[PDB]
Amino acid sequence: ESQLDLRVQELIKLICNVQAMEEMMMEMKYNTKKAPLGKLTVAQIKAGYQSLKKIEDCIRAGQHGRALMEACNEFYTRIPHDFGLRTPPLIRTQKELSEKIQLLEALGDIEIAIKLVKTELQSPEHPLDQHYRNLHCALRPLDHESYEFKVISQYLQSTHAPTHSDYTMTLLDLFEVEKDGEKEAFREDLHNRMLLWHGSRMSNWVGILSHGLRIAPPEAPITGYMFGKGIYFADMSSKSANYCFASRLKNTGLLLLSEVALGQCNELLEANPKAEGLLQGKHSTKGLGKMAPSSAHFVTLNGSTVPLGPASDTGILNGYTLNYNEYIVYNPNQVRMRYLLKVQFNFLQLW
Numbered sequence: 141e142s143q144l145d146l147r148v149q150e151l152i153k154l155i156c157n158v159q160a161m162e163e164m165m166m167e168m169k170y171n172t173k174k175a176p177l178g179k180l181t182v183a184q185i186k187a188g189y190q191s192l193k194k195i196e197d198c199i200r201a202g203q204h205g206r207a208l209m210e211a212c213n214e215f216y217t218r219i220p221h222d223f224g225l226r227t228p229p230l231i232r233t234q235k236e237l238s239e240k241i242q243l244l245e246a247l248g249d250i251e252i253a254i255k256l257v258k259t260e261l262q263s264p265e266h267p268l269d270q271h272y273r274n275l276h277c278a279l280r281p282l283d284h285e286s287y288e289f290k291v292i293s294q295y296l297q298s299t300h301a302p303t304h305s306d307y308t309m310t311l312l313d314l315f316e317v318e319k320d321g322e323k324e325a326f327r328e329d330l331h332n333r334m335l336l337w338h339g340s341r342m343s344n345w346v347g348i349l350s351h352g353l354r355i356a357p358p359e360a361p362i363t364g365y366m367f368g369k370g371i372y373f374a375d376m377s378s379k380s381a382n383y384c385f386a387s388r389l390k391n392t393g394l395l396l397l398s399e400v401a402l403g404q405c406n407e408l409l410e411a412n413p414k415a416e417g418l419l420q421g422k423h424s425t426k427g428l429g430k431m432a433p434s435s436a437h438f439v440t441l442n443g444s445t446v447p448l449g450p451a452s453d454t455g456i457l458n459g460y461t462l463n464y465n466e467y468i469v470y471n472p473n474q475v476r477m478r479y480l481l482k483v484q485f486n487f488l489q490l491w
């Protein structure tokens with residue numbers, strides 16, 4: 141029997157679910173059974189990015205005819221997909237491109253996550269405890285009546301955007317996070333330390349809790365990244381929550397809060413995929429949203445600023461304008477994961 145707190149057992153059982161990783165890949169037309177992750181080569185994955193680059197080139201230039209169809213055939217050649225019967229579809233928009241780009245990263249990530257959940261040959265220990273141990277990340281459940289849970293719930297509820305009205309969120313449980321090595325590596329020296337959201341797909345959490353949040357790999361096409369290749373956070377809960385991709389069938393998602401050492405922000409009104417180059421001494425990029433929590437409402441939690449809402453207009457306006465801030469850092473050493481929220485999404489049927 142498991143020696144873990146019951147709340148941790150449920151958390152672990154949820155994120156370590158292998159089926160759920162298979163099903164997420166299958167949704168992106170990758171069959172892990174027909175094509176085991178273990179057989180992908182480094183060079184195969186590199187060739188796949190190479191073809192996604194040719195696809196991106198076509199798309200950015202509005203070329204949807206023959207050059208695009210060949211680039212897509214070359215992509216499907218290099219990366220095995222499973223379409224059931226149908227004609228492999230053309231990769232035509234930014235959303236479909238970007239799904240492919242994320243797919244490629246998840247192939248290596250899911251492969252390592254599935255190795256992580258392997259229990260030892262001999263061991264009497266409950267598998268939950270082995271899974272938990274293998275993450276190398278302490279997850280400490282907090283009581284609902286505690287001050288910290290109340291503050292986090294306010295931050296969750298107060299910063300749910302008024303324009304994300306398709307669901308509410310309930311906080312089911314809150315875990316304080318202590319990832320091995322992160323405290324020692326953290327840029328404790330940098331000013332402007334903020335506690336910020338990061339939402340992600342259920343199958344990504346094994347990789348995040350065992351590796352921390354990572355920048356995208358060198359070979360991925362840069363021009364999909366609106367502010368460069370770093371780690372992205374929101375100060376609005378529902379904006380990160382949108383990246384959980386919860387659904388009615390699986391209405392449970394996770395949100396991560398991290399202390400992020402922002403230092404001096406390079407504040408940018410408009411997207412720039414070359415944003416990291418623009419730093420010249422600064423430490424992060426802030427993409428300037430129209431709406432935002434105001435510093436008058438801010439509290440602190442362990443010396444990070446917690447930007448409580450509600451959001452209000454910031455007088456930023458433009459071309460394109462960001463709805464809400466987002467923050468980017470370019471080294472994991474500016475991040476220290478701190479709370480993980482287990483969240484019930486309640487979807488609404490509105491018209």
Ligand SMILES: NC(=O)c1cc(F)cc2c1C(=O)N(C1CCN(C3CCC(F)(F)CC3)CC1)C2
Nearest residue numbers: 238241337338339364365372373374380383466
């Ligand atoms: N995950 C978050 O909580 C989050 C919060 C924010 F405020 C903003 C962002 C995220 C988040 O994950 N972001 C990702 C979403 C996906 N993009 C890229 C889109 C282009 C690509 F090529 F496919 C790579 C992925 C990179 C940024 C933005």
